[PDB]
Design a protein around this ligand. Structure first.
Ligand SMILES: *[C@@H]1O[C@H](CO)[C@@H](O[C@@H]2O[C@H](CO)[C@@H](O[C@@H]3O[C@H](CO[C@H]4O[C@H](CO[C@H]5O[C@H](CO)[C@@H](O)[C@H](O)[C@@H]5O)[C@@H](O)[C@H](O)[C@@H]4O)[C@@H](O)[C@H](O[C@H]4O[C@H](CO)[C@@H](O)[C@H](O)[C@@H]4O)[C@@H]3O)[C@H](O)[C@H]2NC(C)=O)[C@H](O)[C@H]1NC(C)=O
Ligand SMILES: *[C@@H]1O[C@H](CO)[C@@H](O[C@@H]2O[C@H](CO)[C@@H](O[C@@H]3O[C@H](CO[C@H]4O[C@H](CO)[C@@H](O)[C@H](O)[C@@H]4O)[C@@H](O)[C@H](O[C@H]4O[C@H](CO)[C@@H](O)[C@H](O)[C@@H]4O)[C@@H]3O)[C@H](O)[C@H]2NC(C)=O)[C@H](O)[C@H]1NC(C)=O
Ligand code: PCW
Ligand code: PC1
Ligand code: PC1
Ligand code: PC1
Ligand code: CLR
Ligand code: CLR
Ligand code: CLR
Ligand code: MG
Ligand code: MG
Ligand code: MG
Lengths: 291, 35, 995
């Protein structure tokens, strides 16, 4: 209790009152100057980066192929007979697809109708504010054959035909280039369009490749991939409501109550892969329609 | 390709500096006339 | 411990009954010349060194393994075990798994290996240096071999060797007394009584302990001198069997290590508490079961300065070696820290302050002062050698003398040869041999009948000589001693041959001459003689020595003799430093008050202005008793006055006096003076050389024993040994003692500074929910691999210029780890280091695409291994591994920023009082560490494969310079703070931040 408090010199926990006030004031001015110096250096550093382009982009290269709905452990397992085992997947698909409905793409200044067939890339010029915002290549939900949220809201999950919409990583200033027909000898047989970055889903093992069933691809114009006319990306400051290209795959005639691991791989010149990062350029999904 | 940063140049520079600094420290600790 | 009187009275078998002939034929030893060196070597190689069997020493693979699996190391070992187990579990699960946990476990293993090897190397070096001290100045034994007496190593003594010991000698092994001359040994360590028992060749008892012809091991001869024959060596000795298994030392606690242990336990408790708290928080935050232990281990390592014990060991050993190289041999490791706390030094005048090289310089006879000791140019003296009184003076100066010139000395002068006897006797011999003639012949004509050596009881010497002349009554008594005492023992004085009664006029002249010679720094000795009447004492009269029969008074004083004893060269500067460092120095000598007063004033003990009561009285021509006792800052206390003094008067003298000099104080009274000094709350260091000083040397906090002229009793009864008996060495030792504290505090401040910048990222990551800025691998890498050398580099820092310009430190109030130390390392420096690290982390993330503001709350999705579409500030999508690569790159950048700020912190930690421009970077080990830590960090960041092994990736150049402003800021801040403390001592900054 002596160290706790002594009434002799008004010492609280070891130090007197005047000393407490003095250290409080000194520490306040010191910490204030320190935090202010930190903020000043923060602002001085910020005055070096641009508002429309990051000073370094080699960390995001090549872009990565992702799947919707976002699933824990990339596992999409549900019971078609159960009306709730696939509610999570359907809801997560709709949460992302709602941004592509005809209602959002109403304004003509923000949304522009781009080629209905795979065409050349829509380069807007330079990454500056001289032209303010830019138009957005509209993408109708109808380009997705049977999983569009327009006719079948279950997207096939109700009839045991799941539809995992594939998506390409949005990268500012990226110009996807599909592989030329000259070297088309390793990747599987797919429709070739020089204006579409291809994507092909296949099995993983000799058992997965057998139990997959029938792959059905839905994309702009029916090409299995992403149309080149939707790139490059100009960021959130130049294209706030930019809509990225999409593509869905329907897994029909798949063995019921069996875990099948499928891998959709995107091909192209600037499309690479990695052994440790299973999402750089391709992605693996484990699906099981346990009815 | 405005997506590839030459990491080998920086790697070599850092390794060169590391070797030089290690040699300097080795000479300082095992100094023959640095009294 | 019932090992006294029971484990001794039973193991007893000796040969004390053997006569001289039986002893000689039993051991086969030349009783008058000793064994031959060849035979000595043969017995040495047969029996072994004269030493006790040492305790078992743990092998090299015992200490190394104990350090490998040490207490703190156990945590990392368990972490590696858990990681390997998790990898085994992951290998049985989903096919084609990753090696993240495997590599992490191997990394922990490498960390443990490096830490164990480094700690083992440091402990091995400390142990080797510590063991090197036991062989610095080993105890010697005076033995007789092949006729010559030589001083050899104690362990080189064998059974049967002819050994000789004297007053103050330590018995090397059990001996049989062959010849003795008033020898008395102390068996306090043998029987229990500290009373000394006589040792004589005469057989008086059949019991080995009670007999007078047996010297036992571990005991010391208090008085006399004798010669014996070794009867048992090594472990076979009497006291050896007991000292081998029943005299072991107990658990001596070092306060410097105790304070550190206390702070270590406090920090360990707070660190483990924060670790388990963060453990539960991490588990609650949906993290891996292994990641929880990872975070816990990292938090504990970064908050526990587990190298404090090693740093303390390094500082103590290094400064102990420093003291050894500067004539300060610390007997125990605790005294190494008591030297810096020294506050009072009770040193002696003759032997320590002065070189004890006396030279007869002045004399006083025929009522006149005469100079002498011609500069050996055969000029004789400045007076006539035919003076009648001078003849009597030389006669009593040479006949009453006891010293003798050694052999092989008739080829070099008298002022450069060696003698055997008292220092004063040596000067007297060199004087009479230079200006009078041959002493060998003078001492032969006047044959000495009986002689009384210098005794404290009589306080004078004595000798009776038969004169071969015809004009004398066949008796010549000669004696010297204290001039004041010799004068009170005479009734007449010889003036140019004629004897006249000693009147008051002659006594007044003698007193004036005494004060005149005493003020010059010379020790005066009184000499007198008497020619006893023949009718009362016939030619054949038998003068009894034990029973004084001849007259002791009414003698005839001849003259005074004074010698020069210059002080050491570094003594004036030493006392100057002592006064400049607030250290009270007291002189304890047995000389006359006037001589001691003059010598003390000359050497600096008594500076100008300071006057004693006697000096003030003399200047104002007033009685000394009437003068004000408080007006004297200095004083000269007489031994007789000290005898009739009480504890109260002692405290008064030692309390209101700043420069005290105790003259004519017997060496036994030193204990009381030391007690009085301690009673005044002061850490004392007392110098001792004789055997009677033992109680004073044992009572004082720091007993300084004379290493050259000091006996074995003082050496074993002291705490430190003065290698050169130079007083300045004590001050240098005190300086080094303070340097240990300075370096220990500097190293403590530097090891704790890094704690804040290392633990702040976890706290901010949990409060701001931003991606982890500093990982566990990084914290472990820093604390156990980069700052392991710099933390030790602070032990080699030299002393500042204000080391001897401050008051001494008291252990009861000034401690190592104080509140201000934490406020400086945890609140001011650590905050800047953490801010710099966070700045570099924000720079990396902002440059890669995530604005500093956007990072708030992203950790939820950032650490998610399945949400691979994290939208950055620009709208880009990053995967899990892609963003994790940036996070690890930020961890490496934080690591680099940490080393950068550590550079500035290490630089400013070199000095806590002066500016870095005054001390300079003379620390080679420190700069070596600066270069090594930078090189190691660069290698760990640029070596290929580190991205998957240590999860450390290459760092871009424009990032290496992000933390430089914070380093320079710490530098300038510490410099201005020290500038304020220097320009305004005792100010708010000093009373609040001076750790
Ligand atoms: C995913 O999208 C695809 C679109 O590419 C959908 O494909 C449809 O699949 C069904 C089911 O297999 C097929 O039905 C077959 O129809 C055959 C005869 O159809 C003729 O008439 C059609 C026109 O009229 C119909 O279509 C419109 C809608 O477009 C309706 O509104 C209308 O009322 C009619 O229903 C023509 O389009 C068609 O080409 C023919 O000329 C049948 O013969 C056939 O029966 C066989 O198969 C049965 C199941 O295998 C079997 O049990 C029977 O015994 C028999 O052997 C079958 O019913 C459609 O032809 C096909 N296309 C279209 C445009 O509808 C697919 O359904 C969708 N997935 C899901 C889950 O909805
Ligand atoms: C794409 O998906 C379809 C259906 O999802 C597969 O076709 C078969 O569909 C039927 C349902 O109508 C499945 O269910 C039943 O399986 C029973 C198990 O027997 C099997 O093994 C015997 C061996 O003796 C086979 O002869 C038999 O065909 C089964 O494969 C059968 O007893 C059932 O018989 C009914 O169907 C057969 C065939 O049409 C008729 O002859 C009978 O009269 C009776 O109506 C029935 O087959 C069956 O399991 C599905 N076969 C599978 C999954 O292999 C397609 O096969 C699948 N596509 C591919 C490439 O596998
Ligand atoms: C008392 C003694 C004190 C010692 C202290 C100092 C310790 C120093 C530590 C190591 C010393 C040198 C080790 C040699 C490392 C180079 C070996 C080599 O030639 O590597 C070649 C290849 C790398 O090729 P890449 O760049 O193309 O691959 C990139 C992979 N991509 C593209 C997927 C990212 O690597 C491979 O194949 C496999 C990866 C090999 C990388 C090994 C690095 C170290 C790993 C574990 C050691 C842990 C030590 C921790 C020390 C910290 C102390 C503070
Ligand atoms: C949930 C949030 C938790 C935040 C936790 C933050 C913790 C910060 C501290 C981390 C490590 C601290 C280690 C201390 C080790 C001390 C060792 C020691 O012996 O010290 C003795 C020293 C004393 O030294 P002494 O005992 O040798 O000397 C005493 C001398 N006399 C007697 C004269 C006083 O301890 C101190 O000086 C007191 C230190 C107090 C430190 C208090 C830190 C409070 C942290 C508040 C954070 C609030 C965050 C709020 C966020 C809100 C967000 C919305
Ligand atoms: C790729 C290259 C890598 C190089 C790595 C180099 C590592 C070097 C080791 C540590 C560096 C970090 C700590 C430096 C500490 C310097 C401390 C000091 O003040 O020493 C004084 C001392 C002062 O002592 P003195 O002995 O010179 O003076 C004594 C004076 N009397 C006698 C009166 C008492 O001198 C030195 O240490 C000599 C070396 C100084 C080196 C200084 C380097 C920095 C110079 C300016 C700061 C940076 C300015 C940048 C400007 C940029 C403009 C665009
Ligand atoms: C327009 C100007 C631009 C300047 C740009 C930077 C130029 C380089 C700046 C400093 C480097 C040189 C420093 C010399 C310091 C004094 C050296 C010396 O020996 O004086 C001896 C004197 C000491 O003399 P002394 O007398 O004690 O020692 C000698 C004793 N005898 C004679 C017995 C041998 O030094 C000091 O007292 C130092 C006081 C320093 C107070 C500093 C307060 C501010 C904190 C930091 C200052 C800036 C540091 C550098 C920052 C750089 C940032 C890029
Ligand atoms: C006189 C003194 C106070 C000048 C202090 C200048 C400060 C504001 C300067 C000195 C060094 C500078 C840093 C040097 C290097 C980099 C890396 C770069 O990729 C972002 C900016 C950043 C992080 C700078 C920010 C501004 C900075 C901290
Ligand atoms: C006088 C003192 C404070 C200077 C401290 C030395 C600094 C400037 C040194 C220490 C380590 C060095 C870095 C070591 C490695 C690399 C990688 C290389 O590819 C570019 C240069 C760069 C980034 C160096 C720049 C200079 C550097 C940061
Ligand atoms: C970054 C922000 C949120 C942390 C705020 C922490 C502040 C309030 C804490 C952190 C460390 C603390 C200091 C730690 C040590 C001491 C020494 C003691 O004898 C008086 C109090 C004093 C001076 C404390 C005052 C309060 C203090 C400065
Ligand atoms: Mg003495
Ligand atoms: Mg002691
Ligand atoms: Mg640290």
């Amino acid at each position: 209790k002596k160290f706790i408090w002594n009434s002799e010199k008004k010492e609280f926990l070891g130090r007197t009152g005047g000393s407490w006030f003095k250290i409080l004031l000194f520490y306040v001015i010191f910490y204030g100057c320190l935090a202010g110096i930190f903020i000043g250096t923060i602002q001085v550093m910020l005055l070096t980066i641009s508002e429309f382009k990051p000073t370094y982009q080699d960390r995001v290269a090549p872009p990565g192929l992702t799947q919707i709905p976002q699933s824990q452990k990339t596992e999409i397992s549900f019971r078609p007979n159960d009306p709730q085992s696939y509610e999570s997947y359907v809801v997560s698909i709709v949460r992302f697809l709602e941004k592509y409905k005809d209602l959002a793409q109403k304004d003509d200044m923000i949304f522009e109708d781009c080629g209905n067939v795979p065409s050349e890339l829509k380069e807007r010029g330079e990454y500056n504010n001289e032209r303010g915002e830019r138009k957005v290549c509209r993408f109708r939900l109808e380009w997705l054959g049977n999983c569009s949220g327009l006719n079948d809201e279950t997207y096939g999950y109700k009839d045991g035909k799941p539809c995992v919409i594939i998506k390409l990583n949005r990268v500012l200033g990226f110009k996807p280039k599909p592989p030329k027909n000259e070297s088309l000898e390793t990747y599987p047989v797919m429709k070739y369009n020089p204006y579409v970055l291809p994507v092909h889903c296949t099995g993983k093992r000799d058992e997965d490749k057998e139990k997959v069933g029938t792959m059905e691809y839905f994309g702009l114009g029916g090409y299995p991939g992403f149309p080149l006319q939707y790139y490059p990306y100009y960021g959130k400051l130049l294209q706030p409501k930019y809509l990225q290209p999409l593509m869905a795959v329907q897994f029909t005639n798949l063995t019921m109550d069996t875990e099948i691991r499928i891998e959709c791989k995107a091909y192209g010149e600037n499309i690479g892969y990695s052994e440790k990062d299973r999402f750089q350029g391709r992605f693996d999904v484990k699906i099981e329609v346990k009815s | 390709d405005p997506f590839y940063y030459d990491y080998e140049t920086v790697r070599n520079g850092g390794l060169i500096f590391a070797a030089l600094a290690f040699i300097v420290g080795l000479i300082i600790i095992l100094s023959k006339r640095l009294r | 411990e019932r090992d006294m009187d029971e484990l001794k009275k039973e193991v007893s078998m000796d040969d004390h009954k053997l006569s001289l002939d039986e002893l000689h034929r039993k051991y086969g030893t030349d009783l008058s010349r000793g064994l031959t060196p060849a035979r000595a070597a043969e017995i040495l190689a047969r029996d072994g060194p004269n030493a006790l069997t040492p305790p078992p020493t743990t092998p090299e693979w015992v200490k190394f393994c104990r350090q490998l699996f040490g207490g703190f190391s156990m945590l990392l070992w368990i972490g590696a075990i858990l990681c390997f187990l998790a990898y085994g579990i992951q290998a049985a699960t989903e096919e084609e798994p990753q090696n993240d946990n495997l590599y992490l476990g191997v990394v922990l293993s490498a960390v443990v290996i490096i830490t164990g090897c480094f700690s083992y190397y440091q402990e091995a070096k400390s142990s080797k240096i510590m063991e090197s001290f036991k062989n610095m100045v080993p105890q010697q034994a005076l033995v007789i071999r092949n006729g010559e007496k030589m001083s050899i190593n104690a362990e080189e003594v064998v059974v049967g060797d002819l050994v000789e010991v004297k007053g103050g000698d330590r018995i090397p092994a059990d001996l049989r007394i062959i010849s003795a001359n008033g020898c008395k040994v102390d068996n306090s360590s043998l029987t229990g009584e500290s009373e000394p028992q006589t040792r004589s060749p005469d057989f008086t008892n059949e019991n080995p302990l009670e007999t007078r012809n047996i010297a036992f091991f571990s005991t010391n001869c208090v008085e006399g001198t004798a010669r014996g024959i070794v009867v048992y060596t090594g472990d076979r000795t009497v006291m050896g069997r007991i000292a081998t298994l029943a005299s072991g030392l107990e658990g001596g606690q070092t306060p410097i290590a105790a304070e550190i242990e206390h702070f270590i336990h406090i920090i360990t408790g707070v660190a483990v508490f924060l670790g388990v708290s963060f453990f539960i928080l991490s588990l609650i935050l949906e993290y891996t079961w292994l990641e929880a232990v990872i975070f816990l281990i990292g938090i504990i390592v970064a908050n526990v300065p587990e190298g404090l014990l090693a740093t303390v060991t390094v500082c103590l050993t290094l400064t102990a070696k420093r003291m050894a190289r500067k004539n300060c041999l610390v007997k125990n490791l605790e005294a190494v820290e008591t030297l810096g706390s020294t506050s009072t030094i009770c040193s002696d005048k003759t032997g320590t302050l002065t070189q004890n090289r006396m030279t007869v310089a002045h004399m006083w006879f025929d009522n006149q002062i005469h100079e002498a000791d011609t500069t050996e140019n055969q000029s004789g003296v400045s007076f006539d050698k035919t003076s009648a009184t001078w003849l009597a003076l030389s006669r009593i100066a040479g006949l009453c003398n006891r010293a003798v010139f050694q052999a092989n000395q008739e080829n070099l002068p008298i002022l450069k040869r060696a003698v055997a006897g008292d220092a004063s006797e040596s000067a007297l011999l060199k004087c009479i041999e230079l200006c009078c003639g041959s002493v060998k012949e003078m001492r032969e004509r006047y044959t000495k009948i009986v002689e009384i050596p210098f005794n404290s009881t009589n306080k004078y010497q004595l000798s009776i000589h038969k004169n071969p002349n015809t004009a004398e009554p066949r008796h010549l008594l000669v004696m010297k001693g204290a001039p004041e005492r010799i004068l009170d023992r005479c009734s007449s004085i010889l003036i140019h041959g004629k004897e006249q009664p000693l009147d008051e006029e002659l006594k007044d002249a003698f007193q004036n001459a005494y004060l005149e010679l005493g003020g010059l720094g010379e020790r005066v000795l009184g000499f007198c003689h008497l020619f006893l009447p023949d009718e009362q004492f016939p030619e054949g009269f038998q003068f009894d020595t034990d029973d004084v029969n001849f007259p002791l008074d009414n003698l005839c004083f001849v003259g005074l003799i004074s010698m020069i004893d210059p002080p050491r060269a570094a003594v004036p500067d030493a006392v100057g430093k002592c006064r400049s460092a607030g250290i009270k120095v007291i002189m304890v000598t047995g000389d006359h008050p006037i001589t001691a007063k003059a010598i003390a004033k000359g050497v600096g003990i008594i500076s100008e202005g300071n006057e004693t009561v006697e000096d003030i009285a003399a200047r104002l021509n007033i009685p000394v008793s009437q003068v004000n006792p408080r007006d004297a800052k200095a004083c000269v206390v007489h031994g007789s006055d000290l005898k009739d003094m009480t504890s109260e008067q002692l405290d008064d003298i030692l309390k209101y006096h700043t420069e005290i000099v105790f003259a004519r104080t017997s060496p036994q009274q030193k204990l009381i003076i030391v007690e009085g000094c301690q009673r005044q709350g002061a850490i004392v260091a007392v110098t001792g050389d004789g055997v009677n000083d033992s109680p004073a040397l044992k009572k004082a906090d720091i007993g300084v024993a004379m290493g050259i002229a000091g006996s074995d009793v003082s050496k074993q009864a002291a705490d430190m040994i003065l290698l050169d008996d130079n007083f300045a060495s004590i001050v240098t030792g005190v300086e080094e003692g303070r340097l240990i504290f300075d370096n220990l505090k500097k190293s403590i401040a530097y090891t704790l500074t890094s704690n804040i910048p290392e633990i702040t990222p976890f706290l901010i990551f949990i409060i701001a929910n931003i991606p982890l800025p500093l990982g566990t691998v990084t914290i472990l890498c820093i604390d156990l691999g980069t700052d392991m050398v710099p933390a030790i580099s602070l032990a080699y820092e030299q002393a500042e210029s204000d080391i001897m310009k401050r008051q001494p430190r008291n252990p009861k109030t000034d401690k190592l780890v104080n509140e201000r130390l934490i406020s400086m390392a945890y609140g001011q420096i650590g905050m800047i280091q953490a801010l710099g690290g966070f700045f570099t982390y924000f720079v990396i993330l902002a440059e890669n695409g995530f604005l500093p503001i956007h990072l708030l709350g992203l950790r939820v999705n950032w650490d998610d291994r399945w949400i691979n579409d994290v939208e950055d500030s620009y709208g880009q999508q990053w995967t899990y591994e892609q963003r994790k690569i940036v996070e690890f790159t930020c961890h490496t950048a934080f690591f680099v920023s940490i080393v950068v700020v550590q550079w500035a912190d290490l630089v400013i930690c070199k000095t806590r009082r002066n500016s870095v421009f005054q001390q300079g970077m003379k620390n080679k080990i420190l700069i070596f560490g600066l270069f090594e830590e930078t090189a190691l960090a660069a290698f760990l960041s640029y070596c290929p494969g580190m991205g998957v092994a240590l999860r450390m990736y290459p760092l871009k150049p424009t990032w290496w310079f992000c933390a430089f402003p914070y380093s320079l800021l710490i530098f300038v801040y510490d410099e201005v703070r020290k500038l304020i403390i220097r320009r305004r001592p005792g100010g708010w900054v000093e009373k609040e931040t001076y750790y």
